[PDB]
Design a protein around this ligand. Sequence first.
Ligand SMILES: [Mg+2]
Ligand SMILES: [Mg+2]
Ligand SMILES: [Mg+2]
Ligand SMILES: [Mg+2]
Ligand SMILES: [Mg+2]
Ligand SMILES: [Mg+2]
Ligand SMILES: [Mg+2]
Ligand SMILES: [Mg+2]
Ligand SMILES: [Mg+2]
Ligand SMILES: [Mg+2]
Ligand SMILES: [Mg+2]
Length: 74
Amino acid sequence: MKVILLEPLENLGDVGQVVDVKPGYARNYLLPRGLAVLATESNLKALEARIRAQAKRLAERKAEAERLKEILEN
RNA sequence: AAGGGGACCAGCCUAAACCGUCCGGCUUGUCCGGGCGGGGUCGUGGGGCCCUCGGACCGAAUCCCCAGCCUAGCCGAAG
Ligand SMILES: [Mg+2]
Ligand SMILES: [Mg+2]
Ligand SMILES: [Mg+2]
Ligand SMILES: [Mg+2]
Ligand SMILES: [Mg+2]
Ligand SMILES: [Mg+2]
Ligand SMILES: [Mg+2]
Ligand SMILES: [Mg+2]
Ligand SMILES: [Mg+2]
Ligand SMILES: [Mg+2]
Ligand SMILES: [Mg+2]
């Protein structure tokens, strides 16, 4: 069963990473402890959108700086 | 059972793509989800979306009116 981790987790994977676990583990541990979510299409979309949104605001800052290197350094 | 002879005869509505709107969620949007509306309905495959060209007839199984019909009757030849 594929899940999306909601947290870093000892020798399983890192937050936002998609891993394969035995359904028992997902259903009766990971999901109830809020540690992961089902890799459904409907929330794979959402993860894609989060990676999307973070990467927008990262490079947007790495411009607000780079462009501020232009106003200074000259 | 197919086929043949007959009876009767009639075909439609959706889901999904996509568009719009309301509402809810937290992991804040190019988000996910629920409702509603739009769109769509097919096997020569059909639809969606993006270009190009083109721009009144049919019509209910719903509704309304009516004929007809039922629920009482009546006239009815000549010792
Ligand atoms: Mg057989
Ligand atoms: Mg027959
Ligand atoms: Mg026949
Ligand atoms: Mg008959
Ligand atoms: Mg929805
Ligand atoms: Mg929506
Ligand atoms: Mg909706
Ligand atoms: Mg086609
Ligand atoms: Mg009809
Ligand atoms: Mg009499
Ligand atoms: Mg008499």
